[PDB]
Design a protein around this ligand. Structure first.
Ligand SMILES: CCOc1ccc(CC(=O)O)cc1
Ligand SMILES: CCOc1ccc(CC(=O)O)cc1
Ligand SMILES: [Cl-]
Ligand SMILES: [Zn+2]
Length: 258
């Protein structure tokens, strides 16, 4: 598989290797704020990241990923639409070549500069690989980034990117606190969807925060200096690593807020 984000191997092509690309619960989607309905049944969202244990940051040729120790319930997402306990395994971002694009979800067709995905797996399935085979296997917390003031809790990430410029590079990334990436409010939209990259599995409860975080132009500029390629390969800048909005089909997006 040689999927990517170019003309020749990008989202329009994915369906030939991964036919679920044209499925019934693909992600991302546009969130129409005048169609989403407040759901009083939603319980409060619980983000419990006090004991989060980060390990390493990796360039995988698609994004940069920060991985966590998920051998115990150290950092978990519960509540909201979720039943049971979802364990944080990793986070990554999607971003644009310019500030006017980069997010995967859109809000009334508005694209943000970037989008953060905090990836959690349902502990009743025992490991990530089993969880992605189930319709309720993952919970992904999605956070929009807009360009404005710098986000101090992102700067440690930005500071290491020079050490993982190319595909297959990794660095130690211990003692990072992902609480510094959250906005003040946990107001959210939720809907059932998919992984936004191959294999595009329909295993995700999406929880997309309404309040974006602000990052500085300097911070997102540094994301854009990464490379999709490996060392010694022709340089391709790691930009526009987002999939566009997919058909909502027979789904409803629920709001946690009036
Ligand atoms: C595609 C499978 O990827 C996997 C990633 C991690 C695990 C183990 C864990 O849950 O941390 C199992 C499978
Ligand atoms: C353990 C890795 O977890 C992941 C989950 C979803 C994606 C797809 C995306 O949102 O880019 C990538 C990685
Ligand atoms: Cl912020
Ligand atoms: Zn993602």
């Amino acid at each position: 598989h040689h999927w990517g984000y170019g003309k020749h191997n990008g989202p329009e092509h994915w369906h030939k290797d991964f036919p679920i690309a044209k499925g019934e619960r693909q992600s991302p989607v546009d969130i129409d704020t005048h169609t989403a309905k407040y759901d009083p049944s939603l319980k409060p969202l619980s983000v419990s990241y006090d004991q989060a244990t980060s390990l390493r940051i990796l360039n995988n040729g698609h994004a940069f990923n920060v991985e966590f120790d998920d051998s115990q319930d150290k950092a978990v997402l519960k509540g909201g639409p979720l039943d049971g306990t979802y364990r944080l395994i990793q986070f990554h971002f999607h971003w644009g070549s310019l500030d006017g694009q980069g997010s995967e979800h859109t809000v009334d067709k508005k694209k943000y500069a970037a989008e953060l995905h905090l990836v959690h797996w349902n502990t009743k399935y025992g490991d990530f690989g089993k969880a992605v085979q189930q319709p309720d296997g993952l919970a992904v917390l999605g956070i929009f980034l807009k360009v404005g003031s710098a986000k101090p809790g992102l700067q440690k990430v930005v500071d290491v990117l020079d050490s993982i410029k190319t595909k297959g590079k990794s660095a130690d990334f211990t003692n990072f606190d992902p609480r510094g990436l959250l906005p003040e409010s946990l107001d959210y939209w939720t809907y059932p969807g998919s992984l936004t990259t191959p294999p595009l599995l329909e295993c995700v409860t999406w929880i997309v925060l309404k309040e974006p975080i602000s990052v500085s132009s300097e911070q997102v500029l540094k994301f854009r200096k990464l490379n999709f390629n490996g060392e010694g390969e022709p340089e391709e800048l790691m930009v526009d690593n987002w999939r566009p909005a997919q058909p909502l089909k027979n789904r409803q997006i629920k709001a946690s807020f009036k």
